[PDB]
Symmetry: C3
Subunit: 152 residues, 3 copies
């Protein structure tokens, strides 16, 4: 069975007890699709995101899904942290995830999330909202199995 | 909010023709809570980058360029813009290109970027009046939100 | 008054052994003939450095258009995008995007293709997928823009 790691990228979330829906939404999607083992990290924006990515990549996790920190305000550094770890980017997948938020949420176009491969790990940046997360998972659902196989 | 319009066209800056895009952009800005500075019409290449740097250093909130985003030897607006940017916003440039479809297939050849430099938002638009209108229509729904975010005002989840 | 030349590069290591059934080359050749490209040349190279070698050669020769097929995925052997970006002066992201979108919605995995398009020297370079279907999808995207793109490159 394939392994997965969820990384909630949010200083706000990491500053207290996590009680938000996005982690569970993603974990439930993964769990119900038979990913195992399966774990969840909530980390602050900036270097802790890159640190968590590096940890999971060195551990050869099959799939990493991050949520949050993809926008254009000063604390949004998930794309930076992610690109720094990637071997290559998969632009069509990030574009598809953005497009899934249109026309309902015009500011979907401001998300700078990337997807890509690092080592033998697929990494997918999702947005921080439950709606954006669900939209992104629905995009991923039709390609994730094929993507993991092709990486292998 | 402040805005700077930059027309990138050696032929307009000469000027062998009168630019139509600048006034379109200016009216659009004025409808929407922007106070435009005097537009600049500059020749392609380094003058574009120099006008971008001047505006960023003067902390203009929004810069909109028009022209020089194609793939001819003198289309260097994307190169000049990227050189000034801190980061790009790919989804916005994409949406601006898609807005030209399916009516103008060569819209897909535009290499315009959008991004942030300092606390300034920079948007590359095409050099045609039609392309500018299509792009402004895209920008309309997101531009104030974007500027608020770049100013450091936000609500992280 | 001068016609545009086109080079077809099929990126497939297998086609060096008796894979022998490259269906895509002929499809692209026919499509190029139909759009006035001449002369035409086609070749198959293995994944990796030979692709870049083939790209570099045709760019130095001022070939007008290069279409590649294959090696644009996310497998460990898919290196066509890396090889291409190494030769490019700049990318044309809208074109690669349109080619990917042409595979939707019937082929969801189209979004995994990392092919690029761009200009090197005076040469337009277009990465297409390795499947006959993806090639046909990509060629349909090029059909109403490729000569316009070469017009612009030349001025």
């Amino acid at each position: 069975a394939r392994s997965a790691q969820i990384i909630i990228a949010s200083t706000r979330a990491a500053s207290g007890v996590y009680t938000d829906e996005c982690g569970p939404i993603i974990a439930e999607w993964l769990e119900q699709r038979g990913f195992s083992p399966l774990e969840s990290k909530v980390v602050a924006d900036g270097n802790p995101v890159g640190e968590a990515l590096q940890d999971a990549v060195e551990a050869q996790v099959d799939l990493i899904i991050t949520s949050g920190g993809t926008g254009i305000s000063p604390t949004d550094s998930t794309p930076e942290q992610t690109v720094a770890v990637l071997d290559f980017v998969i632009p069509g997948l990030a574009d598809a995830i953005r497009r899934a938020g249109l026309p309902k949420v015009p500011t979907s176009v401001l998300s700078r999330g990337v997807c890509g491969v690092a080592g033998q790990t697929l990494i997918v940046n999702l947005p921080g909202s439950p709606g954006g997360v669900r939209d992104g998972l629905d995009v991923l659902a039709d390609v994730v199995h094929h993507a993991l196989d092709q990486i292998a």
